[PDB]
């Protein structure tokens, strides 16, 4: 139907906007600490601690399959990256500290993303 096509164009345009959001958030992680899944070869107990791992490569795979229906879903995955890290790692670690800085800097980006999503519809 034509309605289904219009819905699909809306999803495509959200995907475009979320790709720009993802790029801007990933720039806030210049150490690439959050770029890839935590390796279960290198951290064998990880899934005992963290039940829903997340990372920017995993998000990018979902994004490119148009698997984010709205901005809430995307933000959920970004918050997982941060929150997982802040539980597994202690406060005095480069990993924790990177996550705090990513949260703080990413907030700015996400605030305007939400306005753009609502504004453009």
From Swiss-Prot:
Superkingdom per UniProt: Eukaryota
Tissues showing expression: Highly expressed in testis.
Domain Bromo: 9-113
Covalent crosslink: Glycyl lysine isopeptide (Lys-Gly) (interchain with G-Cter in SUMO2): 41
Localization in the cell: Nucleus; Chromosome
Biological role: Scaffold subunit of various histone acetyltransferase (HAT) complexes, such as the MOZ/MORF and HBO1 complexes, that acts as a regulator of hematopoiesis. Plays a key role in HBO1 complex by directing KAT7/HBO1 specificity towards histone H3 'Lys-14' acetylation (H3K14ac), thereby promoting erythroid differentiation.
Subunit structure: Component of some HBO1 complex composed of KAT7/HBO1, MEAF6, ING4 and BRD1/BRPF2. Component of the MOZ/MORF complex composed at least of ING5, KAT6A, KAT6B, MEAF6 and one of BRPF1, BRD1/BRPF2 and BRPF3. Interacts (via PHD-type zinc finger domain) with unmodified histone H3. Interacts (via PWWP domain) with dimethylated and trimethylated 'Lys-79' on histone H3.
Name by which UniProt lists this protein: Bromodomain-containing protein 1
Gene: BRD1
């Amino acid at each position: 139907s034509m309605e289904q096509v219009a819905m699909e164009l809306r999803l495509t345009e959200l995907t475009r906007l979320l790709r720009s959001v993802l790029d801007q958030l990933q720039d806030k992680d210049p150490a690439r600490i959050f770029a890839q899944p935590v390796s279960l070869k290198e951290v064998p107990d990880y899934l005992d601690h963290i039940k829903h791992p997340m990372d920017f490569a995993t998000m990018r795979k979902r994004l490119e399959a148009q698997g984010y229906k709205n901005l809430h879903e995307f933000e959920e995955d970004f918050d997982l990256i941060i929150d997982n890290c802040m539980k597994y790692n202690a406060r005095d670690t480069v990993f924790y500290r990177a996550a705090v800085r990513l949260r703080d800097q990413g907030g700015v980006v996400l605030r305007q993303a939400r306005r753009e999503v609502d504004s453009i519809g």
